[model samples]
Target chain A: MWAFPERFEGRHVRLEPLALAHLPAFLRHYDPEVYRFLSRAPVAPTEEALRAHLEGLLGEPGRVNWAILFGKEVAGRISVIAPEPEHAKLELGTMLFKPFWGSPANKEAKYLLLRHAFEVLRAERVQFKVDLRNERSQRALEALGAVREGVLRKNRRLPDGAFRDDVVYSVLKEEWPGVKARLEARLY
Target chain B: MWAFPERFEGRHVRLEPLALAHLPAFLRHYDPEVYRFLSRAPVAPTEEALRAHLEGLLGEPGRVNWAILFGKEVAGRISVIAPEPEHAKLELGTMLFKPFWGSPANKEAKYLLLRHAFEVLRAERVQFKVDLRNERSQRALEALGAVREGVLRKNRRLPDGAFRDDVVYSVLKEEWPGVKARLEARLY
Candidate 1:
């Protein structure tokens, strides 16, 4: 079955299931600027609010929430949403600490996640939806060789009653070989 | 807030909150053909199977299910799912008998539904999603002048365990005046 990964390892980084203890580490680097590209309001504005959000994510049995680790420290977070084993598919998203942005951590972290999604879960396709305003994520996904699917306008609502457009992209199993190579090419 | 419409009436058709008593009327035209474009497998292939599906749908408080009527007879079904009152929005969907296809029934049914969604509910926007393979459906929505937003790739799991892509569309409150005129012109 396409269950959540316990841990996924790569050349430079690893992903462990997100736990209550990782909150402080994640909170230390979080800021309003870090949440600028996120579609929804970040509850991480306060420790209690962030704890509530983390608890809710943890409570959701369908989601695979993970803490991205570079060496021994938490670099960020990643998630595999709506895993479907019967159909061999899933979706993934991430948020990295500003200090880790444009570093090897993200590339290696994605490498591990994709490796687990394709090699371990046998997912035929993996999807990523990015906010249209996020050119950085747009480039990151493109760098991973994810095929541009389309844009969903007003697909998500913000707490301010505003809407966010999304760009949907996918990476198929057939393309994973080359994508994995690309990640390795960048990481190593 | 976002409550179901007890009665939504127009010239040629009406929509009422779907009830257990409407099952027989709905079953008369049920089959795999009617559900070819749907992600979830329609259990109406057998009565009891459909009853279970209906029961589950009825149980979902987030969904607003309606039995569409033309004159005294049941013409079809529809739903407004994930109603958001804070920002005023919902997604609309439909299911009609072969007899009702390409008729005034669908047009008037949608007209009344839109009226309720926009006028009664004070919604600022209404959205729709259709199976990408269903060109007939695609054309119908296009005919309504709904903005062609974008697509969600492999967004849903079909009855046969296959994935179905979806085309997303929306009608904003600002555009409802024009859209309502278009619907009224066609219906009248």
Candidate 2:
């Protein structure tokens, strides 16, 4: 197991490894309303349930789960999960506490992860899939310069037992340079 | 043979049949600079060459090329080509005069084609492909709510003898409503 702390930092945020101490702050950012369309088994309704949920993710292999910290509180969480070696791609998902909404923190966190995925891990592409109905997430991904790929019709089942279509987006290695500059300029 | 034309009328634009008389006006819209990455051969550098090119396109049964009209002048052209009847799908391509570069005419044109393809022709999907390096076309397609499916690497050779990857985008029947609304809104 390899852990790289402080791998990358954006203008107003820092990415830190998932740990026990961050769990409390992490729960504060976990809003069930925001998780409605996310494939994850929904945000646990109780703090105890949320803590256990975080524990499970921490133990998953090929998953680089990070707590996005703004100042002294956890602003959000982002994860880079590698499903296969040959694909040379990783799936990314992020969730921010409602307070950080419309702020620059989400963009900063994304920039950090994208830089790491491409520069450090040598990924050919980084993929993001948002719920088809989640316009905010789709807009954020677009703003970060990810090309809107396609919809995976009936991609996953939600906690409510309904099928949710996933809108896929990707940033390829060739497009990275221009995308990076665009993202960086926004942080200024 | 079923010829269906869905008139897309904006304050300053409409889409009409690609008649023989429309060729000269249509030719004026073809910017040599913009055609640099088009998979099909570039616009002929001379009037005789362009006329010959238009004749060839008119002869192709698999294509439906239309002249985009802006008031009285031909502003650009779009076509739904290579209809795969068995698969219920078709490929689309478009070119605009430099004058209508960022106007609502392009969106209206697409809306017209999509309406005919889905509502009238009952196509299961409508697809568009652009040269991988042609970021402008790709962005235009994205703005029309076309979800990019994937990139076919080294798919075709351009007239300049350079190999170009094709970035594929599609709009399925289920997604037509939202896409249609987005396109129509551009006119307003």
Candidate 3:
């Protein structure tokens, strides 16, 4: 069986294993802009709609999620999607509220997650897929030293049935040290 | 609830929905060479080993598979791996016994499957992932007019606990007509 920590803490952020209780605080910071590139979250962003969405993810096989917390308040969410232990690989994804966009919340959340994935889980590779149109997220992934593999066309289907391309990126175990060093300096 | 036809026939070959009964004939033609690129099937190729291998495939969610028949005998197997109806996409994979390697069996099986995917299923993309070391399969996909996309590193894990990269290829809906024409002329 695979395992992940129930909680993780960094200098400025905490990641608690996602649960139903996070919904109330998540609703408070809910912003559609945060989900502009993510079809999993609803544009409506009602308590009921968001609850169903998060519930679906919670039940997904091989996926584990965390609610990003700053000072005990929900800032957003992150996940290790469909980990393949045999392959020693997993994907990292996140959503941060508008107010926390430029703050250290997102990066520190990533730092905490990456450390656990590499140090504890002994992952050989960690990957991320960003929507092609989401330049901000793409640049952010690159800034953290993840190599852009390629663009997969029509790889994702939106809730409205439209197709979207995704730019795939990865940080292999060999390069994780460089990435970690970069994150450490910038994060501190 | 997606649907697919249980059987399809071509000029020189027929595809029947895979079953345990095909195992007896499969083991007769079982050549370790067929599994050199694929680790799913055992190199030992005993009736019990092949049965377990195929049973695992039969139980895979959202996957449909077929036994390739040339004349009245089982030639090999082919499958539409993990069809994604929402994205109008799917993957094509196959294994041909040594006797049927250069015969029309492999090509016609692909022809039949690709037609169904684009014409009936209305798939926007039909992709394939060949192991990086499998030059023959990569060349065959190129000959079928499939576009080589990019290589995905360490995407698949072998049962022996080693990693393998995959070279991705795809046939878009718009490109299918030309591919069909090419196959029609060559296959005839």
Candidate 4:
């Protein structure tokens, strides 16, 4: 069963269910910089290649993907990853096109996702994973009051065939009230 | 692919490929105490139930199971959980009967597994997860020099349908040399 809704809105961003229809607009801003820290490689700039890539992500059963929008502009992409309801946990994954990095969209999108994860889905823990080299994302999570758990060595392989360590972070349900307050204070 | 050896011998213990043949002998020592910290619940104490349980474990492709032997007696079960050759990482899981809890079998079995994981299998990391409530196991890992990463809230569900947190630990490739040396010093 799909536990996430098709749409959610925040002060600066909106999450619209990801579909092939957004592929054209997404390709307009798609840049290699977006995939720099992501485990998966970006497809060729060609429409057909990007379509195949997006198709796989969209069709994944346990993940909910969204076309992140800042106002009317397509900001980037975000997803609720590996939602294991039975375990009461899931991970949040996001990547913004280079231009959208540090935009209000990033925080608002996360706020929307975290709100849904704890309040609606009843998840007890929401986690994020950043490539060891990605201090940008790490700082973003820290600023949002996430606890940096530890590094998982060589847990993921990059598109370049090199093993990469991931720094894991999490916000537990018990800590959510404070995290929610901080996120809301910043957004509103 | 089987990345671990079928057998390994230590000064105080031995690891033999797990098989259904060991089921009857294991039943002789199987106690609920052994399953207290394990994520999975002990099956009904019947040959049929345990046989089915063992079959599922033995048939799993990615995992390697072994019967931990102390002086040729079935001490308990150990598994190389979630081996990912591509990512160069895997998890080590062990459960010893009450009699073997503090025995030399525990450390020796871990030594053999870590030796194989890093030296033979070329793994970059070996991880362990212990239930939050299992202080005995937690202290054992700390004593063994494993780094306690952090607590994963509600990451696992128990047989009673209650969620449980797991404290994760890991030994990275760079740290393995020291860990191996310490383990060897203790065993020899």
Candidate 5:
């Protein structure tokens, strides 16, 4: 099993394990608009629902969920859910509070997740799945050096009860060194 | 029946319908080294063998092969093969001379192929496949906005007695406008 320490640092941000104590700050930072076309549903309507969601992500086998902390505040949430380790692969999903949008925080979060997966966990591949209509997510993943693999048509149903095609992208372990360098340069 | 035009233009390239007239230039442009990891064997050592190979591409139903011309010289080849109109899909492939490496010719060729497939031929999806080891080809396809779907492990065996995994990628009609714009901005 792979695990993340209580806190991991990047040049611009730190990722702390998702915690119940962080839920209120996270809910305070949430923006429903940000999840407009995400594969998973939007942030829960009520505070209680959101906290329960965060709690569920804490310490499940083959997964590590974290809160993006900028100094002392929760800036976002990110997770690596590797259902099948034997396949040497995992899927990552992230959400940022609106303030962290368009900042280096998102990139740092990704760099940390990718670094942990490819280096420490030694995963052969890490992937990102975006709603086909979420061009922003697609572009961000591409900029991070994840190659667009393909889309799964009508792959999953969204909270709105509509089907969303999932666009897939991946970065292999062999490609990590360059990606890490690019992210570092971007931070600088 | 969908047919390739006698000529099509990109900002830096002109794709001419491949014919016997283009064979010698193609033969000159062909590099056996390019096929180092391809499932298909490289060009045969003799011209007679090469001639027979080029002739096989002529007027093959479900395949439209083009000799990519840069200015007046044959610089590479691009082809649309395995048309499945009923499924609204087609497969495309490209090969370029070593000298044409990193040139805008490829982006232009792909743009033209995609335009025809989506706009003219009305294809909903354009598919591409590359040898798993051919990272260059995979990167090029991804840059062209083809989403990498998944790998077909041990998919086929080459004449050389090695099994080749096919890396698949694709682009859809609905996403063409954005994809085309990005490609043009990057290549132009």
Candidate 6:
């Protein structure tokens, strides 16, 4: 049996359980750019709120949270949220500090997490959600070989009160092997 | 203003807050036929479990439970699930006893609920989910003028220990006037 947010290893990256103590080690990488598309607002200006936010997210009912590790250092945060065990489905929610924005750290971390989700957790499907306005983020999900399902009109709201449609995507068990191969082939 | 598990009135029907006391008044309507496609299955289904199920569902987070009423009779149960305030959306979960089946009572009850979700709650979107095998439920949702979005394969587990694809559907605030007209035109 696999415990969520447990150790996940990869050639270029790994995922470690995220914790409140991890926040102070690399708060400099925390920036508004990283939080722009997140469900919560810019916590870059303060330490307490950011800590509170991450700590709060870790214990929600359906998900387990993680810190993306590149080598020995923490690069970002990722979560296995909305777990539906009986249905064998869950959502992969992610966020990164500014330095990990366009790095191989993101991709490699994804690979390890995906492998752990499908291979270890035996999840049948993993879904992703992206802000409709974020082209780069949308393409990143596509590059992961996830199938684009449909757009939910005005599905989410931002801190500014503006609403954006959410573009839905998923990778099913039947398609996971191919996706896993494709991801492994392209990894750095 | 958003009084959940609150009263909603319509020309032909009304929704009363659900409670444990109404069980015996309509126990016959609470058969397996109505619950065959539900997420939870029938089990230990004594009058005890039935009462426990209704009482528990009433207080679950994010959803407000309701009893469908036609005149003085308790006809069935319905719910407002997954209420998202920032995005202003929620889902309508319904189950009716057999006496109200094929009667105008079901359609009228939905009309009152939709009106409350949009006009009262000011929700932007309302969604529905049905097992792919339940053709009649699919037709009833479509008859309400909700749009069929997509299918989630093996999306849910039913009482029978079997999984089923869920056909997703939704109706948005902008489309409510037209859907409202269509439902009104078809109701007895």
Predicted model with the maximum DockQ: 3
Share of real interface contacts recovered by each model? Answer: 0.28, 0.05, 0.28, 0.62, 0.13, 0.33
Query: Cα deviation in Å at residue A120, candidate 6?
Result: 2.5
Worst 10 residues of 6 chain A by lDDT: A25-34
Predicted candidate 4 versus true structure: per-residue lDDT over A5-66, tens digit per residue = 78997778888998888887667887876777775455677777778778888887788899
> Each candidate's interface RMSD, rounded to one decimal?
3.1, 8.5, 1.4, 1.8, 7.9, 1.6
lDDT of each: 0.80, 0.74, 0.86, 0.83, 0.76, 0.77
The weakest ten consecutive residues by lDDT in model 5 chain B span B153-162
TM-score of chain A for the candidates in order shown: 0.92, 0.88, 0.95, 0.93, 0.88, 0.90
Cα lDDT for residue B97, model 3? Answer: 84
Candidate 4, residue B67: how far the Cα is off, in Å: 1.4
Query: Candidates' DockQ values?
Result: 0.38, 0.04, 0.56, 0.55, 0.07, 0.50
Candidate 1 residues A61-174, lDDT tens each? 678788888877888888888787767788888888888898798888778888888987778789998989999999999988998887766667777777777798999878
Model 5: runs farther than 4 Å from truth? A39-44, A59-61, B1-188
For candidate 3, the per-residue lDDT at B181 reads 98
Tens digit per residue, CA lDDT, model 3, B1-188: 45888999899999999998888877787777778788576736587788888788788887899999999788988999988887899999998888888999999999999998899888988899899999999999989999887877888778877788888888988899999999999889
* Candidate 6 Cα RMSD (Å): 2.9
Task: Put down candidate 4 lDDT per residue, B1-188, tens digits, no spaces.
Answer: 54578899888888899998988776787676666676545567777766776787788767889999888688887899888777788999888888877788889999988988888877887899999999999998888888887887677876677878889998988889999888888878
Docking class of 2: incorrect
Q: Give the DockQ-based CAPRI class for model 1.
A: acceptable
Give lDDT tens digits, candidate 2, residues B7-40: 5555667876776887777466666766677544
Off by over 4 Å in 6: A24-26, A43-49, B44-56, B159-161
- lDDT tens digits by residue: candidate 2, A26-51: 56666676667655543557778777
Q: Which stretches of candidate 2 lie over 4 Å from their true place?
A: A1-6, A83-86, B1-188
